[PDB]
Design a protein around this ligand. Structure first.
Ligand SMILES: CC(C)(CO)NC(=O)Nc1ccc(Cl)cc1
Ligand SMILES: [Cl-]
Ligand SMILES: [Cl-]
Ligand SMILES: [Cl-]
Ligand SMILES: [Cl-]
Ligand SMILES: [Mn+2]
Length: 340
């Protein structure tokens, strides 16, 4: 039967089921005030699916110049055409190859660039902004979004949204790599999975995806969305409470020293955006520092709410198109204040 919500991460994560329900705020706001992330499913059913396909982005914008990142080694591929990324999104025999002759796992950097999403893609902008969940928090002029209402004593987010496009990580060695490394934001954010591309060529890659989710610490109910409902999984997230950020910095300073990095005692390994917490590091954070996180699988049409100050990392299972909007809730405005 249809219900309003469920609890994932062994009861520790709210999952809303109706993205446009006028009463969602009554369930949301208590979890949000406690500094927890929230998942909202079903946003893909509200969108115009023809606007969010890789072949359309290639046809309309393919002649623009961009830089890519090689996810495996962080090498920058400079000044290529954006069609060279899009045409390899799902079809493995079209991907740029490294010198070993293997197809690369690539991330499309800063595209559309800076604040240009609205100017470059006005119809996509309308379709996304009109269908964001919790609109009093997430719309540019929502009553509970302080972004447009704060003086210069607060760090204000750029004008959004921002698009995040990258291929899926494939191999057993790839399990230790991030799509986006561990970092934090001083604003709140909502991140929507608008498209998941499951390839063909090296298609039959189902098995390494299940081992990644299982070793990723995903709960038993999350494993049921695959086997029972056949939903498309996009990306594995780990999110940590804002209150645990300094304990994470202590672990990463100790590990940086063990690995012969030579860092001053005060340097900030989260701001550096240079670490991915693999199974070994996540277990060491729990056992040695007492810190538990949330392991979240973001399926097609899931919106992940990330609280200001919360350290988080992202590992794509398949090729993903994500679109994110920043906002400033009253619950978490302390995180962007420039004094004390
Ligand atoms: C039978 C329906 C309406 C179909 O979606 N399911 C619900 O109960 N939805 C619901 C979601 C949020 C709130 Cl706050 C209230 C109700
Ligand atoms: Cl907080
Ligand atoms: Cl458009
Ligand atoms: Cl709302
Ligand atoms: Cl990164
Ligand atoms: Mn982020």
């Amino acid at each position: 039967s249809m219900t309003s919500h469920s609890w994932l991460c062994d009861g520790r994560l709210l999952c809303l089921h109706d993205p446009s329900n006028k009463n969602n705020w009554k369930i949301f706001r208590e979890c949000w005030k406690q500094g927890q992330p929230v998942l909202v499913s079903g946003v893909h059913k509200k969108l115009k699916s023809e606007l969010w396909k890789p072949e359309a982005f290639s046809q309309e914008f393919g002649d623009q110049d961009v830089d890519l990142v090689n996810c495996r080694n962080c090498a920058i591929i400079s000044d290529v055409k954006v069609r060279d990324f899009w045409d390899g999104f799902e079809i493995i025999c079209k991907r740029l190859r490294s010198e070993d002759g293997q197809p690369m796992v690539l991330k499309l950097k800063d595209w559309p660039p800076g604040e240009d999403f609205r100017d470059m893609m006005p119809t996509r902008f309308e379709d996304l902004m009109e269908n964001l969940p919790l609109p009093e928090y997430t719309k540019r002029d929502g009553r509970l979004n302080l972004a447009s209402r704060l003086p210069s004593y607060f760090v204000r987010p750029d004008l959004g949204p921002k698009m995040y496009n990258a291929y899926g990580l494939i191999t057993a060695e790839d399990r230790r790599v991030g799509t986006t490394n561990l970092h934090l934001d001083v604003s709140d954010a909502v991140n929507v999975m608008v498209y998941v591309g499951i390839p063909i060529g090296e298609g039959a890659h189902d098995e390494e995806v299940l081992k990644t989710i299982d070793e990723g610490d995903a709960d038993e109910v999350t494993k049921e969305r695959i086997h029972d409902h056949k939903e498309k999984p996009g990306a594995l997230w780990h999110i940590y409470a804002a209150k645990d950020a300094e304990k994470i910095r202590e672990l990463l300073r100790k590990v940086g020293e063990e690995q012969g990095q030579e860092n001053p005692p005060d340097h900030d390994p989260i701001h550096d955006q240079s670490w991915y917490l693999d199974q070994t590091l996540r277990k060491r954070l729990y056992e040695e520092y007492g810190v538990q996180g949330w392991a979240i699988v973001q399926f097609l049409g899931d919106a992940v709410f990330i609280p200001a100050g919360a350290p988080h990392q992202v590992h794509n299972l398949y090729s993903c198109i994500k679109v994110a909007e920043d906002f400033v809730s009253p619950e978490h405005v302390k995180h962007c204040f420039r004094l004390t």
